[PDB]
Design a binder for this molecule. Structure first.
Ligand SMILES: [Zn+2]
Lengths: 199, 340, 207
RNA sequence: UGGGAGAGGUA
DNA sequence: ACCACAACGAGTTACCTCTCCAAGTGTCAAATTTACCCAATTTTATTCAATA
DNA sequence: TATTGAATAAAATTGGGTAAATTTGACACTATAATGGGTTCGCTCGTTGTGGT
């Protein structure tokens, strides 16, 4: 039977279950010691017998491997210290966990903040370039900065080479937004795809 | 929706000497204890698992008392006013709705309590197989001796116990042979071993004569009193309302056959057959045989005899280290005195 | 009840053949604390532990310990058997030695004794009745008629008789059955009693 | 569980 | 009778860390086990009288 | 007044056999033409047997 990582661990005391979360993984920051539990992984032991006691157990609950051997990862003895990082990899097809969803959301928010700062500085450089070609074409200094920088596209003049450059850098900013959301989608599917783990 | 209670009623049903309602009581006590230990508040929740549905509704209980402790079960007379005084002071009915979850800790404590419930239900099975027949010679094989007891069996996963004091002094039962014993009066409430079987009781000899002799079986010859020195010597008392068949000759049989049968089944114990009489004086001058009678003083108040006995028969009159006087006194009820 | 798990634990390390091992907990017990509990339960109930290890051929040195404890019990209990209670010192010590050794070999005799397994059932004591399978359809079992259910040839008590009448020549078979053989059966019943009380004290320790 | 290689290190 | 080749064996001790190491399925003859019978043979408690 | 040796009957064992199940091992799956393989060195020094003008 396939193993599972859940906080439901048999025949252990609830003191050691305080360090784990509700999803079976230890909290970031918990000062563990030797002989403690870090992640609760249980193993199906095997049916191998048909007694009325286990028959009534599998009748009343449905835990069809109600004999399970707790084989959780424990910290080796003489070792101590806090917990500073927990990384959870998963294979394809299996729904991961609440904890893996939380780690995934945190990594997603961090990558999205980095890509947002990247887009902010890139549109800053592109709007500096459209300001440079605008002051190369004509003399407009106060009327460009008296209006906000993000709306630097609706201002126009007579149709000429600088107007053609204004509209071509407008559509270049549009395809910059396009490749920006494509980078977002690539990052999202890269951190949402299941890992190429061992067989 | 529960196919699981349907499995209880046909698929995972018990041995058929156990009722279904006790299994339902076992599982309802199991889920009650499982929801009892799981709640952090000291709630003695007793859940009514109704029989036909399988699913249920969790029922935290309340008994009508006026105490200060246990507020989760402490309802008062003014709380019985909500059901307007139609109940009793102290019954633990409920007026609440709760839910239920599952967990492997609940699973293991449920396993503990259901093996306890099927254990006591099998104990009640041995209780009714005891109370179906009160007092008889039985036969089982000894299977596990102990320091103070000898465990037995009667088949169908039953067990019996010979204690230390109610066996023969020449007992030697290697585990594996069949022994004879009489269950007499066992404790049906005993949490450990129940079926108390003896081998050195007067009930043993009278039940052995009952299975041995058909006129004991159909009440032609009757045995009234008994006397025992286990393994060595014995005496039983015989009266008979019938006048046809010779009583003592009947219970000795063809060349001491029935006496040798009970003697080899008892371990060489010299059962000495002697008549029972109703009157005390002539009963005891019949009873001390093979001793001789000179003169008898019958005493009423302290329940004793006084026996004059001539010289020569003192050793066979007293037995060995006062054996015959002791055995005859616990035969007749009258303890004996020495007179020349 | 409790004792046979320790006989499982007296073996060397056997190779495992399964998937993910090493529960790494105190679920049942370890393999060293069981021996520590055997040590704690040796000051009382050492007779039954020595007899159990000698019977199951694990630590084959406490066979002599069990024979010595049985010899001490026979020396304490010999004052109630008319055949042995009249003999002199070293001769009574030697007859107690020889019937203690034969009583302990009779207690030790199970279906793993070399030359003692049943011929037909191969020790199981349970053969299949072909007629009941032919009339019922399902598979049935019955009692092995040669071994009569026990699965092994029992030890005859006359082996000790032959081994004692090389020392007490004037002791025939009727008086052997009359006032010697109850001591032999008392010895084997004492072996079973001591093993039971040692299992009880083991379960009282490791609880 | 526990075996074998290879690499580096300590006295 | 008196010299140049292959191959073996040897190279301290102990400890530490790391990485890396298809599918039953049907069929057929011969050998083998297996459940049982049984005569002999041993075992073991019981009997008869003869001393104790 | 017991206790014990000769005799003894019933039950357990044992060696041998034996007719009948049953297991063991081996097979069995089919056509253009096709026709001789990829390893190993600077990796020192003593001994000993085997083969050689
Ligand atoms: Zn057999």
């Amino acid at each position: 039977g396939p193993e599972e990582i859940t906080a439901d661990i048999p025949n252990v005391g609830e003191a050691a279950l305080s360090k784990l979360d509700e999803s079976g993984i230890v909290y970031i920051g918990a000062e563990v010691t030797g002989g403690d539990i870090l992640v609760g992984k249980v193993t199906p032991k095997g049916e191998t017998q048909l007694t009325p006691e286990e028959k009534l157990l599998r009748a009343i609950f449905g835990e069809k491997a109600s004999d399970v051997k707790d084989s959780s990862l424990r910290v080796p003895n003489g070792v101590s210290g806090t917990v500073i990082d927990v990384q959870v990899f998963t294979r394809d097809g299996v729904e991961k966990d609440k904890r893996a969803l939380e780690i995934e959301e945190m990594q997603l928010k961090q990558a999205k903040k980095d890509l947002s700062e990247e887009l902010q500085i890139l549109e800053a450089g592109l709007f500096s370039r459209i300001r440079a070609v605008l002051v190369a074409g004509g003399v407009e200094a106060e009327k460009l900065d008296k209006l906000p920088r993000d709306r630097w596209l609706e201002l126009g003049l007579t149709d000429e080479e600088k107007q053609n450059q204004l509209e071509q850098l407008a559509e270049q900013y549009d395809e910059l937004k396009h490749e920006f959301e494509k980078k977002l989608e690539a990052k999202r599917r890269k951190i949402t795809q299941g890992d190429d783990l061992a067989p | 929706m529960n196919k699981e209670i349907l499995a209880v009623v046909e698929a995972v049903s018990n041995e058929k000497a156990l009722p279904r309602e006790k299994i339902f009581e076992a599982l309802e006590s199991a889920l009650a204890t499982a929801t009892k230990k799981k709640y952090e508040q000291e709630i003695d929740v007793r859940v009514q698992i109704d029989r036909k549905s399988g699913d249920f509704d969790t029922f935290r209980r309340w008994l009508v008392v006026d105490e200060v402790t246990q507020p989760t079960k402490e309802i008062t007379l003014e709380a019985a006013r909500y059901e307007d005084e139609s109940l009793n002071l102290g019954d633990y009915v409920e007026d609440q709705i709760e839910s239920v979850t599952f967990d492997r800790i609940t699973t293991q404590t449920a396993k503990q309590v259901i093996v306890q419930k099927v254990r006591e239900a099998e104990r009640a099975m041995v209780v009714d197989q005891f109370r179906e027949h009160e007092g008889e010679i039985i036969t089982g094989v000894v299977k596990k001796v102990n320091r103070d007891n000898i465990s037995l069996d009667l088949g169908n996963n039953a067990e019996a116990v010979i204690l230390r004091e109610d066996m023969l002094p020449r007992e030697n039962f290697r585990p594996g042979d069949r022994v004879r014993g009489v269950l007499y009066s066992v404790r049906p409430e005993a949490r450990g071993a129940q079926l108390f079987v003896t081998r050195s009781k007067p009930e043993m000899l009278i039940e052995l004569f009952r299975i041995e002799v058909p006129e004991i079986g159909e009440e032609v010859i009757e045995i009234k009193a008994a006397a025992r020195d286990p393994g060595s010597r014995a005496k039983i008392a015989v009266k008979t309302n019938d006048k046809r068949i010779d009583p003592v000759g009947a219970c000795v049989g063809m060349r001491g056959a029935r006496v040798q049968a009970v003697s080899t089944e008892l371990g060489g114990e010299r059962i000495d057959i002697v008549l029972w009489d109703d009157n005390p004086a002539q009963f005891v001058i019949n009873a001390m045989a093979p001793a001789d009678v000179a003169s008898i003083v019958v005493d009423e108040d302290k329940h004793t005899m006084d026996i004059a006995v001539e010289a020569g028969n003192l050793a066979q009159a007293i037995g060995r280290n006062g054996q015959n006087v002791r055995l005859a006194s616990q035969l007749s009820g009258w303890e004996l005195n020495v007179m020349t | 009840m409790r004792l046979e798990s320790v006989a499982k634990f007296h073996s060397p390390k056997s190779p495992m053949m399964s998937d993910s091992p090493r529960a790494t907990a105190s679920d049942s017990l370890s393999g060293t604390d069981v021996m520590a509990a055997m040590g704690m339960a040796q000051s009382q109930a050492g007779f039954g532990m020595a007899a159990f290890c000698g019977k199951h051929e694990l630590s084959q040195n406490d066979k002599q310990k069990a024979i010595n404890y049985l010899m001490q019990f026979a020396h304490k209990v010999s004052g109630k058997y008319r055949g042995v209670a009249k003999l002199e010192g070293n001769t009574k010590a030697k007859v107690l030695q020889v019937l203690a050794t034969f009583a302990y070999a009779d207690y030790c005799r199970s279906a793993a004794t070399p030359g003692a397994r049943c011929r037909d059932c191969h020790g199981t004591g349970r053969a299949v009745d072909i007629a009941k399978t032919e009339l019922w359809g399902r598979v049935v079992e019955k009692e092995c008629g040669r071994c009569k259910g026990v699965g092994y040839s029992r030890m005859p008590a006359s082996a000790a008789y032959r081994a004692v009448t090389m020392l007490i020549p004037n002791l025939t078979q009727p008086t052997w059955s009359r006032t010697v053989k109850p001591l032999y059966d008392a010895l084997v019943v004492q072996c079973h009693k001591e093993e039971s009380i040692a299992d009880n004290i083991l379960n009282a320790v490791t609880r």
